[PDB]
PDB file of C-alpha atoms in Angstrom:
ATOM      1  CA  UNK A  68      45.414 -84.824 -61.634  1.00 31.48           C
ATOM      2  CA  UNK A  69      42.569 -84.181 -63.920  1.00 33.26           C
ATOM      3  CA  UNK A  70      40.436 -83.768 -60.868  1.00 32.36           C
ATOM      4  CA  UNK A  71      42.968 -81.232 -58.997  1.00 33.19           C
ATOM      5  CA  UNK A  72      43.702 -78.875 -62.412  1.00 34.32           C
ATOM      6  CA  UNK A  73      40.030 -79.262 -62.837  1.00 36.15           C
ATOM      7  CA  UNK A  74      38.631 -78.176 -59.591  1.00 36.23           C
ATOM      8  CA  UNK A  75      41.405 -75.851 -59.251  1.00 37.74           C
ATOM      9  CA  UNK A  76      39.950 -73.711 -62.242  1.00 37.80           C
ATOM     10  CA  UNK A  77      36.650 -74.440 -60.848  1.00 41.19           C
ATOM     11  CA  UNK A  78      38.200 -72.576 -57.435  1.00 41.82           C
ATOM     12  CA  UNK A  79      39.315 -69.914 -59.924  1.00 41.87           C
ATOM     13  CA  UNK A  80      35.445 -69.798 -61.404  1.00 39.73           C
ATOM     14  CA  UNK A  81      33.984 -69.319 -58.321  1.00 39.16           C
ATOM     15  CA  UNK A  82      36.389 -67.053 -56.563  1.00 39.38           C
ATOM     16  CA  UNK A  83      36.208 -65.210 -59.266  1.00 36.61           C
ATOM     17  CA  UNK A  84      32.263 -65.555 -59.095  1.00 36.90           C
ATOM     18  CA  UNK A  85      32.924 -64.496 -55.882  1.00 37.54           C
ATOM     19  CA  UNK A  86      34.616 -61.059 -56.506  1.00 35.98           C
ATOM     20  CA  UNK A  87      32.409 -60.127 -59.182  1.00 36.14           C
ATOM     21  CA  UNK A  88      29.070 -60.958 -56.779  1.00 34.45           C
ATOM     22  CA  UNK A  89      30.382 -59.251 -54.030  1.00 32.09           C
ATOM     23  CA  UNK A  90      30.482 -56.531 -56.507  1.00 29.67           C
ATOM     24  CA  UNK A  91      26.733 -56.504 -57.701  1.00 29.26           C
ATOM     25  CA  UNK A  92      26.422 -56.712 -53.856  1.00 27.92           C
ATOM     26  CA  UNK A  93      28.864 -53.780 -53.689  1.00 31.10           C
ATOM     27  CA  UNK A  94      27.512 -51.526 -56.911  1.00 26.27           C
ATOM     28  CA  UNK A  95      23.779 -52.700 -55.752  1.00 25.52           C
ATOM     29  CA  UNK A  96      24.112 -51.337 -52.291  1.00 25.59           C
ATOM     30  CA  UNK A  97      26.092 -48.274 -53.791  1.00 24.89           C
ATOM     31  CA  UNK A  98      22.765 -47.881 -56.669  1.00 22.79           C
ATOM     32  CA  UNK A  99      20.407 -48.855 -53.698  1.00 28.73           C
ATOM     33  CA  UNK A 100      21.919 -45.745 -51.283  1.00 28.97           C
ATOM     34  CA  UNK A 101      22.382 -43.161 -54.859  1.00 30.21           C
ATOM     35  CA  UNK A 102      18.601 -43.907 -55.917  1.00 26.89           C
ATOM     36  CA  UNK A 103      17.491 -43.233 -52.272  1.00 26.17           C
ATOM     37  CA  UNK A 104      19.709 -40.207 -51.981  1.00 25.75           C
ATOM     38  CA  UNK A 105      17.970 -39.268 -55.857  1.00 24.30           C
ATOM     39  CA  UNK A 106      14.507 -39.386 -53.856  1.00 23.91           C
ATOM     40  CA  UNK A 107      15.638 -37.488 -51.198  1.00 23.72           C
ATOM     41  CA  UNK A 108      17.128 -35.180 -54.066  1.00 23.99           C
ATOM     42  CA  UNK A 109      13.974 -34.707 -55.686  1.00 20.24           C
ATOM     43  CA  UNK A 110      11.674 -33.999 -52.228  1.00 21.46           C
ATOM     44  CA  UNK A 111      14.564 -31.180 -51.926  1.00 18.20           C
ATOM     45  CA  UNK A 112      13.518 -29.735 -55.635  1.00 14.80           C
ATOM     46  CA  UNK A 113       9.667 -30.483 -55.031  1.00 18.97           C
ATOM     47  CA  UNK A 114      10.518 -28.445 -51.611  1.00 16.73           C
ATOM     48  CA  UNK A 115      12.607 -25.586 -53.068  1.00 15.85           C
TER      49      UNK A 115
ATOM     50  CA  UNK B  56      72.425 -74.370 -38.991  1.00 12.45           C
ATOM     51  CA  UNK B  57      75.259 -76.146 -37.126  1.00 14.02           C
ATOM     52  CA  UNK B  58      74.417 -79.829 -37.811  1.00 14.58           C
ATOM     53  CA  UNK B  59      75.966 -81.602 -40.800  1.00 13.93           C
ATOM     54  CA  UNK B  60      75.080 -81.369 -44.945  1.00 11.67           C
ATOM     55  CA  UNK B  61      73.658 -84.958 -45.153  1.00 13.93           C
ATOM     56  CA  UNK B  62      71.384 -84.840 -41.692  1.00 14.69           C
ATOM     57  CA  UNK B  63      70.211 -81.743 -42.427  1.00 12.05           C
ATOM     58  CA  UNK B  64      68.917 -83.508 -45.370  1.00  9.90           C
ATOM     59  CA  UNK B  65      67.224 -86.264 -43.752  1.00 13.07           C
ATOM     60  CA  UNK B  66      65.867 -83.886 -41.366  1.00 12.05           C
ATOM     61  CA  UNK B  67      64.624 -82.095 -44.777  1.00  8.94           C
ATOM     62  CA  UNK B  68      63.406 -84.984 -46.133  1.00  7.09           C
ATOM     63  CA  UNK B  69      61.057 -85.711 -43.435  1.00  8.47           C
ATOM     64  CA  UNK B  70      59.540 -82.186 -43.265  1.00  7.79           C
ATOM     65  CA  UNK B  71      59.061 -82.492 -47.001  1.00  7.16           C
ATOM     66  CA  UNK B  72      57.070 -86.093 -46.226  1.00  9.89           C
ATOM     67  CA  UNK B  73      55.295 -83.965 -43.703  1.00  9.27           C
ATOM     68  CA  UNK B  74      53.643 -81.623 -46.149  1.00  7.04           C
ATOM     69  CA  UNK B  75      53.128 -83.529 -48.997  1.00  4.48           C
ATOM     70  CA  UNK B  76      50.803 -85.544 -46.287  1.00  5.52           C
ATOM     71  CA  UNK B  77      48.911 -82.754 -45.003  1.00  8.24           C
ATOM     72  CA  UNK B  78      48.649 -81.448 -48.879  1.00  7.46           C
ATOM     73  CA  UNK B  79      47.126 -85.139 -50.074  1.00  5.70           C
ATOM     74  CA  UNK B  80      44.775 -85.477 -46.878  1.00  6.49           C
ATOM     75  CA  UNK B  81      43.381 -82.217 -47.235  1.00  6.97           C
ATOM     76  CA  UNK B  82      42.603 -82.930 -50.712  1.00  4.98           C
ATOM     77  CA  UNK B  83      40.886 -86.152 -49.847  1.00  3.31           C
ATOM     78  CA  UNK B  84      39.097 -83.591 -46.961  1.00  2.00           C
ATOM     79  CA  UNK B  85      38.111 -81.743 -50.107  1.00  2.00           C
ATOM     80  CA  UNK B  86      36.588 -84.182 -51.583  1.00  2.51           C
ATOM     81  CA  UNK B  87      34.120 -85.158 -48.800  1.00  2.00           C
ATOM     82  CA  UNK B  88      33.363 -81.253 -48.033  1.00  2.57           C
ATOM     83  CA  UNK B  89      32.547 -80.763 -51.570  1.00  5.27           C
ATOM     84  CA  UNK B  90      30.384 -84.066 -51.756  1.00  9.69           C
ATOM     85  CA  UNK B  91      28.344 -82.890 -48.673  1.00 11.99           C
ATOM     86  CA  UNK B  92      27.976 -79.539 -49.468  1.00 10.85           C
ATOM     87  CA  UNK B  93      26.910 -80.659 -53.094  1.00  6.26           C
ATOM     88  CA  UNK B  94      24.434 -83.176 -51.315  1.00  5.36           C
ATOM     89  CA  UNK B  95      23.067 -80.457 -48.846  1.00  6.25           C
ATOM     90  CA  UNK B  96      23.133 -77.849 -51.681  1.00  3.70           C
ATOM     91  CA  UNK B  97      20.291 -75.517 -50.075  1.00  3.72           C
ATOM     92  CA  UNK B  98      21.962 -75.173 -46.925  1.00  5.63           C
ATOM     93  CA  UNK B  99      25.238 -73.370 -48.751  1.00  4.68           C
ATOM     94  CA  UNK B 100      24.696 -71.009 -51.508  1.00  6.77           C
ATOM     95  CA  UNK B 101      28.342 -70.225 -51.887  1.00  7.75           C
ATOM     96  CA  UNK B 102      30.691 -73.136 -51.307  1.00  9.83           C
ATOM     97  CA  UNK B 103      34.407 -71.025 -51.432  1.00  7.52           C
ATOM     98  CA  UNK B 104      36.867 -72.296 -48.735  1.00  7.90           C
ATOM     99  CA  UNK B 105      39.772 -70.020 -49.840  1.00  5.98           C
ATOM    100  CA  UNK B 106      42.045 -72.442 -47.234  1.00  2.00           C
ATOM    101  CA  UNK B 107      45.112 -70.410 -46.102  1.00  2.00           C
ATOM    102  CA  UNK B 108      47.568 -72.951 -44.598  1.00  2.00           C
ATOM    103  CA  UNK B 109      49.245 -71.076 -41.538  1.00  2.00           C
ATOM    104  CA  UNK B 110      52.446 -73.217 -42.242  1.00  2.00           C
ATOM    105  CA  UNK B 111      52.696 -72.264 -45.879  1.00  2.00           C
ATOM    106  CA  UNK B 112      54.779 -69.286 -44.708  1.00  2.00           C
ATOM    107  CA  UNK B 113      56.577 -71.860 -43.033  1.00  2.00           C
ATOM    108  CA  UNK B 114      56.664 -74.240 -45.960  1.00  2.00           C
ATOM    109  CA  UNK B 115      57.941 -71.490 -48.988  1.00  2.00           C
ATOM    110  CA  UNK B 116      60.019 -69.614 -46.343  1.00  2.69           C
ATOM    111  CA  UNK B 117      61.871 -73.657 -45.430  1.00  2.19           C
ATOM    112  CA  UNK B 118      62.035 -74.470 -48.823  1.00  3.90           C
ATOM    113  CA  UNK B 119      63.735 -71.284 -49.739  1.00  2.00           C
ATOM    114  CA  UNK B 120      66.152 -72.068 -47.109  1.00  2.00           C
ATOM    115  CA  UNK B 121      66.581 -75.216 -48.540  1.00  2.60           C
ATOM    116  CA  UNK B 122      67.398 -73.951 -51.861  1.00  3.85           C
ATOM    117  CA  UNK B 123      70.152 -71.018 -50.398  1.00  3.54           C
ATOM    118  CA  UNK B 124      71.998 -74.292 -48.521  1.00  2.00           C
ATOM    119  CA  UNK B 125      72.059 -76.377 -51.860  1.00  2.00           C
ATOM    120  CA  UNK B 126      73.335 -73.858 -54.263  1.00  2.00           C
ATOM    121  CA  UNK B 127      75.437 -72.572 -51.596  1.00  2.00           C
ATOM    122  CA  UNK B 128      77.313 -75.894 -50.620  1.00  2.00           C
ATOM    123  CA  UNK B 129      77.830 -77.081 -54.046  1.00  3.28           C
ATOM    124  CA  UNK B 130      79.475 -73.355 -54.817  1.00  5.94           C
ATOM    125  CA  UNK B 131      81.849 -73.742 -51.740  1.00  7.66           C
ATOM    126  CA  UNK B 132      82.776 -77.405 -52.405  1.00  8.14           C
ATOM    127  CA  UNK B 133      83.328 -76.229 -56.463  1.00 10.47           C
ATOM    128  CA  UNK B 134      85.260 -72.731 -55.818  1.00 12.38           C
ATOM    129  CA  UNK B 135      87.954 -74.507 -53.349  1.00 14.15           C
TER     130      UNK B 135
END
């Protein structure tokens, strides 16, 4: 029993874990494709 | 739905045995995945399983028709 309520919150850690990282890996790729598009962005004002 | 209170029961009974047997060996299962992933702890980074049981539709949906029969029959047999 200890070992069930205890690895069950230890499922809830890392599923939660799990959300939240595939989170960085969602707000990382979203950061990753706004700084490229903010390079792009500033060729277009070196440009104009 | 046609056969009698009492073997319906034992008919319950057994499908209750059934699941509490799955539920205990998969958490034996459990305990040897998580030993060998802990053991080969390089090859998996993340270790989730996030097991959903096809039959646990089967299992709530069952047990709430359990539940309907028992309240049900005891309300008949009391309101005659």
């Amino acid at each position: 029993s200890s070992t069930n309520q205890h690895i069950i919150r230890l499922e809830s850690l890392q599923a939660e874990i799990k959300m939240l990282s595939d989170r960085k890996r969602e707000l990382e790729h979203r950061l990753s494709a706004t700084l490229e598009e903010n390079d792009l962005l500033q060729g277009t004002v070196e440009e104009l | 739905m046609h056969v009698a209170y009492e073997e319906f029961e034992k008919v319950m009974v057994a499908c209750f045995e059934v699941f509490q047997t799955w539920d205990d060996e998969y958490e034996k299962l459990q305990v040897l995945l998580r030993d060998i992933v802990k053991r080969k702890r390089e090859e998996n980074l993340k270790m989730v399983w996030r097991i959903n049981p096809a039959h646990r539709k089967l299992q709530a949906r069952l047990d709430q028709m359990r539940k309907f029969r028992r309240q049900h029959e005891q309300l008949r047999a009391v309101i005659v």
